[PDB]
Design a protein around this ligand. Structure first.
Ligand SMILES: [Zn+2]
Lengths: 120, 68
RNA sequence: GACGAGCUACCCAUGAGCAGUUUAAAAGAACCAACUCAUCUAUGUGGCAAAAUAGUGAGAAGACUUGUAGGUAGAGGUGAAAA
RNA sequence: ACAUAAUCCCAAAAAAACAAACUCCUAGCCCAAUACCGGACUAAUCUAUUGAAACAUAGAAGCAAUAAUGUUAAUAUGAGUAACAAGAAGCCUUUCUCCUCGCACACGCUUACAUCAGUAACUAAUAAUAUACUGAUAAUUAACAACCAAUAAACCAAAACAACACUAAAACGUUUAUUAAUUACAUUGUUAACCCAACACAGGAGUGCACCAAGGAAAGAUUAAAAGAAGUAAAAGGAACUCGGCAAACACAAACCCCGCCUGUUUACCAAAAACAUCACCUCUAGCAUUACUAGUAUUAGAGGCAAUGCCUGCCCAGUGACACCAGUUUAACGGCCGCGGUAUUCUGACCGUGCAAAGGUAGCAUAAUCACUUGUUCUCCAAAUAAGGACUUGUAUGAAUGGCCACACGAGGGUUUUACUGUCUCUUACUUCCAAUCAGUGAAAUUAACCUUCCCGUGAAGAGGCGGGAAUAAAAAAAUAAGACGAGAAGACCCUAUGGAGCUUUAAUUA
RNA sequence: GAUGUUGGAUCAGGACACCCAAAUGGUGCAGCCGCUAUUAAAGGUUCGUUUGUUCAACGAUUAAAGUCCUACGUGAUCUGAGUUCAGACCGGAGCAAUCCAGGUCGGUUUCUAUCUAUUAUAAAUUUCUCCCAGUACGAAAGGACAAGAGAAAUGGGACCAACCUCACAAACGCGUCUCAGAGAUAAUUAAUGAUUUAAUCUUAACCUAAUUAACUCAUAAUAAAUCCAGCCCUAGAACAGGGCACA
């Protein structure tokens, strides 16, 4: 039953779900803003906040280091995340990963479109 | 299973019209605070935003091509 | 009266294929991939398919598998023989 | 005293009227009908006459349609139901993520392909688009693969990285001599894209070597219902499930039988088995030549039965068959191999008598793949054993080459008992994925006399939603359950009928 | 131009000729247990071994392990064990082609629901043990009705605090908690004053004493419509329900 359950499915397996989150977060941290389905976005929010917080923990700390290496394989994302994106959010707490809605829909599945963006 | 008899027009109409309520019409229409164009409620405009998003995408591609 | 052995059954001619391991000389025995079969169960039941798929199982140097070129037909042929 | 909801048609009541194609009255086209028979007429086509965009005088017919699981065409129902379609970010082209199995030679397949241009429409079940759409325009060679000397002589000792050896007695090979040939600087094809199964179809096939630097992405999205499919996990018990440990996680320790020796083969598509084949045993027929047998010769060939091997295969030739000829022989030829009465505590009958027959079951085996009575009796196994194993023998209805009795090994064959381990079960629970559900795109099918489609008690060809009487009920969907509409689907495959058909067998009759 | 024929599983409903639980009569009923008959269908009526059983025999319990009907209920829910047809043997019959209402093995079970129908309010039900007691009664053996108390069981409606299966804060039993008056009539049967019929009689009349389930409630769950865009939920197919300090 769906009673009291976060962590949705979205028609993907656990590995496929995790990999999807890693890819969407890759694009998110790379382009600073991305466009995806409302469900995937709303789900991506929390994980994004988590990765940001992990970046806020410490650079030298091993826990944060191996966590960041675990989720993000790309070597381009990590230094840009720690050195650039992290220090500007230092004062913020829940103030990152904003979600907005897109006016139109796809011509195929008419999927509701939403955009996720970090505060500049 | 198989249908016992052919459906009459009346039953077909009453079945395909009344309960489904056709398409319920609410008001999604709102005027954009910027360009004044008519767009959907609780949603970003499709005029003054998509062009700025395409210009921001071209500026991000030009910056990524200039940095490389 | 004729058409049919490019399916299949048998045969002729000419080619090709069948890892690895234990082993006393042993193309010798047993296990096990390809390949050749279809034991059981499940799924499929206007289907993926008018003979299927998944797990499992048999043979797997032999009476083995297979390509190409040929032969045998209804007052019959063929058939390790089931009408 | 019978089996869904009561009263023997509502409700009640108590202890001379109403009421039929009958009769009469009023009018007139004057007094029903199935099979069958008779009379009189209408619609349509064409011809003669007449009339001319409407008709009647006759003659002549392919002359009047609601049905044949009719034919053809159009269009519905089911139904907006089943079904088809899981990566992402960007950016003009990359990055990240997932799963692997495929590149060359063909037989083939007859421009699919490459470029450009255009995609309302059709085409790839849609979009994106396009290697698989339209239109127009490009389509590489060769030392690659196909296409070529006539004959006549010499020679023995197979192939298995083979001096050798073995068996199954051996794919391709060379040399000598004679004649003769020219531009043999040529001709075709490849390299285009893949194809057989009605389909851009989880199914199909030949050859060489990689398993990756080749290649494909579950390329519409949501919902986290029931239920189904695949998969994962489980307290305690550990086959208590069930026709059967089927299935299924864990494992395979031990026991005992039937059948078949075994390695194989067989109803392509419900049977893979005890069946067939198989080595081996026996019987019996063949002393003969140049397109079977066989270029073989009693150690060979054909035919039949049995089926490794181990121990054996007893009697009967009156009948049939066969061989020598009217008589006899012949059982590993077709086959056959008894009954009754009497005799010692009980019982039983070594023995005896008798009828019959060609001769009356010897060894061995036996409630058996055989035993009707039957779940024979006894013993073992189990807390209980119509099954199983081991014995007994009144063997309904075993029997010695359609072999008899055993037998190591062998078996996807047919049965029985312990151990081990398990969601099989007590007893089910949770999770994952594909469907089901929603939205959007494309849009079926069988079925269908028309359907305003409730229930009960009765009736009706005897099982009613359409009949009667009571009860119940404003009008329409979606997700689910399968009782009814004697549901849908097959002109019952059982039974019988027809002076139907076909296969098979004979002492049915009749004969090239 | 087909109603698919046994059994089992599943899901029930009904009949009463009642097995058990309940209320009684008679008994060769001391008592306890039985026998026989009456009233009563609300609930319950087990788990195994052999064999296909419809059976039957046997094991252990239980308050009992009832019978029958429903197309000998139920295959558009399942099962193919039996049997209804393509094979392999034994035995019997037939010269043979082949059979047998005989016994051993093997043998693919097709369908997406059009209509009708259906997708729950409740109040319970059964048992054992203990206490009075080992008294009355009886030579001895033997040996309650009532009242009271504590445990379960089946089952109704539930819940997740512990334990358990649990990789989020969820769903479950294997875990925990609860289960109730009362009124009236049953058919039996036991009476009070008492006629017709000086007696007698539970009945004819009439005021009236007492007796299973059903049949009913003193009652417990229910209903303030008339905005609900949008965001969320232990709510959920859609819908409905809930919660979010609108311009
Ligand atoms: Zn605007």
């Amino acid at each position: 039953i769906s009673h009291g359950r976060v962590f949705r499915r979205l028609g993907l397996g656990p590995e496929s779900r995790i990999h999807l989150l890693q890819n969407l977060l890759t694009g998110l941290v790379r382009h600073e803003r991305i466009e995806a389905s409302w469900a995937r976005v709303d789900e991506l929010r929390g994980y994004a906040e988590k990765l940001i917080d992990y970046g806020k923990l410490g650079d030298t700390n091993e826990r944060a280091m191996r966590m960041a290496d675990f989720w993000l394989t790309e070597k381009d994302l990590i230094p840009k995340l720690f050195q650039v994106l992290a220090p500007r959010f230092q004062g913020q707490n829940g103030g990152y990963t904003r979600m907005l809605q897109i006016p139109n829909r796809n011509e195929q599945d008419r999927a509701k479109m939403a955009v996720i963006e970090y505060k500049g | 299973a198989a249908p016992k008899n052919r459906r009459s027009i009346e039953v077909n109409r009453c079945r395909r019209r009344n309960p489904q309520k056709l398409i319920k019409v609410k008001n999604n229409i709102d005027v954009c605070p910027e360009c004044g164009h008519l767009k959907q409620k609780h949603i970003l405009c499709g005029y003054c935003x998509x062009x700025x998003x395409x210009x921001x995408x071209x500026x991000x591609x030009x910056x990524x091509x200039x940095x490389x």
